[PDB]
């Protein structure tokens, strides 16, 4: 009713330990959510076409052209790690657990409050806020997944990461099919390469509305809404990283001479002439057995074209790759392709007391070693006569198509039946948690945005909207926009996300890497003297595991 | 390709795709490996090039042997120099049963 | 049936270069043993093993 | 697996054999820029050391029960059962040109 | 380094780190350990799958 | 029998997780143990008196005078952390557990081998080693605790810390009562201060022999010996440290003015004149309420005289103190009193490939903040008229007894009914694990050498000795030493030490300190290229806990 | 545990003492004096007082 609360605030994280070294992790998250009435009550079909940017030759990667349906609804999205875990919980999980299973997800809305704004227009302007006891909040749960899946973490538009900071939902919109052609060019390209927005293909038209597809609940101040528990069916997520490349698989060569003194100058030696060695190689016309040429069971990782842009009906898009560059761990400047870069605002980790629209950014450098170092690649002739002469070798410094800045590694692909790789690591706090699986006949082996992929279904998207609060002068047959009482809503959101994790064991004599507070990062985890908070990113696959 | 007379496009060519069909490696008698452990990566290779049989969950533990230290009367653990041992070697019989 | 792959391609990772493995051996090696080359495993062994 | 180094038990029942000294890879970082004959200068060829987060020092004694066998003792592993895919003893000949 | 310091010899790289243990490995994972040529002939001539 | 093994080698550590967040930790430790026959078969009563050292005025702290019974027996002592845990297990325990309970202890001896040494005396001298199939190893377990308790960790003489390194027992000996007087002096003291060894008090004489007090088992090569399981009754050991001193207990003062901008220059202010404040103080004649003067519930820590040497019947000994110096954490040079210093050899953490008799050393700086900073102490007159004048204050720089290097803090004691303190933290790897409780009517509240103290009893000491291997010419009535065949024994020792630990919970937003491998300490946990190993010390109370 | 004596007397009498036989600041063991290397009977850590 008017004066009775309809729910409870809970933002605790409970670790319930089982037998056999498993733990149930139930993350409770609660937020005060602020929602204004939509700018307009109508669905819009809006085309964006930044021709000015792409009209500059060589700027085709800056294409923003697209068509989207703008809806009056707002999306409540909790699909991001920072929503559910503070840094202490994350430290516990990543330091003490070896794998993580996504179990269930629940959410509810309670203590709904709706208010109207009255502006007096007095010479000193002033306004007052009145409770609208009979106004309603419209809530729709797309449990059948009829609406397009639009996870907000990819735009950094989920619920905020601070329990004591009120947050907002994000205005909902989804892609509307369009055709677009963009011929690539470079600086010094003569003329205007074709840069055209062709319109919409009628056979691909899909205009979705919430009202026609989803039951809509009207919540007054005394009402509440609960989704019920959803249970996931995803694969487990490892909290360890592999380090073994092809060079560290299997039995090392026997060393016939071992160092007799310590130091960095005292190496061992195999002690057998390279073409007089025993073992197996896939090179049937050579006698050289070396660490480079010896047969390995399969290939860890794969090379892919990097900063390749493929074009389809909707225009160019970057070719995604499964794993980040090799050597980025030793030199952060070499992260580049496959190392996800996250940009986010003050709701999601940026120091809350900073000013300006510039976001906080970081590039995630995963601990796993499944990537490539293209400067170390080469192709050489089948004859394999060593030392290889210039004409019999293709080096990463050899131009392709006459371009000094492009080599064969830029267009190289070694993905095959022997390729082995890992799933993407969780990115705390900004990374997405779960993602819907594509509805294609043949599905990708993984996603690059979330560790957990929903095979059959995962929870319906939650949509909210302030119900129209008409004045006395409404006229439906009038073309002009509806005249509404300025109305906004504050409601409380509570979610429960349950995981199942396995406690790690100590397999080696040595200790392993562990997340730790220290003198340098100390003040990333406590408020400033004026209450400024931040959440810096954390790694998740600290402990190694043996690949083979 | 790239101005190199000894390199052509086939050296860098890849036609692996969703339509690719292929076979497992044949057994190599007598020197070929029989079984191999599967990688502990999330995504696994479709085959191995070294053994026809690939162990999915596990395959037999490796067997390790070592002659136990046979100390002389003058052992000193706190000495940095190498342990003084009686020259000892072992001969044992190994029997395996492999069923196909 | 089958696939073409880069042959005597050497990819580099953290531990240094390694040869790109391929699933099947060269065609025409059956008629001419000199054309075995990539994908045809070569075994080297001592007096214990043949 | 020792077959990749040709270091398994011997293939002759009447010939005494030996085991192979055990060793395993320890993580290291290494950069080797490729070159050819006639490449000017010294391409970077560096051993960078070991990444601490990849360090794995295994010992038998800390991970495996160790049986001490005197001359009157014996040791049996017990039967291990595989779960591998079948291996064909036939070859296909049809390329794309001989289908259908 | 002496081998790979020669330009064009990068395929001869043997660089690596290994733990040398006092233990010895008894490995029977090879066909020759289990079959003489007569048994192998029987298997490969009379069987279609293994 | 001769050709049959009587036990199995096990050096694994198993973590068995229970419900309610408890884990059973069973540490298995196995060692090959080398034992020579004793130098002599007789008990000796030996007096050590380093008069030359103490005859130098001001060297009285170097006194080594004592009497001891030297026995032919050897003590097998496994009471040290390094015996049971490698660094990886220790990292797991200290990073993931909040408290540790000592549960049970078992040990056994098996695969006994006895050999004789025959020296040929050939012009090139040579010797051969024969099995003595009928020789025996004498094993005695003092399960009733009749013998004096002599834990070897205090001399760094326990079993070695490496499963693959053969170890030795330590020759057993125990203190024999003596009377000794040593008058302290300094450089420039005139004459010879009395420095006398008075002999032995007859009413304090205690001559213990193994043979008269303990059953002795004779083990031939086919025999084995097991102690049976002993169960401890000790108090739990915390794996967290407290940080709150008296200054951080209870409600802080309310700040009437808070900073409006970030930075190290923007402090808050209480905003109330100090003698106009509200609250409670124990200073009944002052109106000043400050953080220094406000009443706190009790006292955390206590001041004690430091490098005080008290004298009793047996001569001077240093006064022990419960906790180490404050400020040693920020400056390792200020560790000094209460910070235990461990010195050990190549069996117990020193780099095994080093040479020379100089031991490896470290001073343990505990994370707990229960210590004192005597340079910050002061005493002032009861009148408490501020600012205090020189005559009304005793400062740490004021000489005591005319000595410029001695101030009142050197003789100060603030232990009282309000004192609170913690138990000593475990010291990995060299620290002792458990210690026997004194048999006095009034017992100490803790020990400074071991976290676990045995109240009623803890396991009997294990004694071993090669049985006499006589030649054919033995003559008991001859005064000369017994003529024995040169005989030594190698046997395998296996112990099982079981703990019970509680998994830690994350109580705070921020992460906590955690033990971790990094680029600097990386090569402390792996062997060198010539097989050199070391075990560096680790801390054990990394995570904080709230005291109040 | 008393210190181990590396040299024991070879004849009886009140003049024939044993000797520890290790230089005092080169000894092994535990002390509560964190800024000294001297391990002696006076300075060696004892369980309590």
From TrEMBL, chain G:
Q: Where in the cell is it found?
A: Virion
Q: Which domain of life is it from?
A: Viruses
Q: Which family does it belong to?
A: Belongs to the parvoviridae capsid protein family.
Protein name per UniProt: Capsid protein 2
> What is the originating organism of this protein?
Canine parvovirus type 2
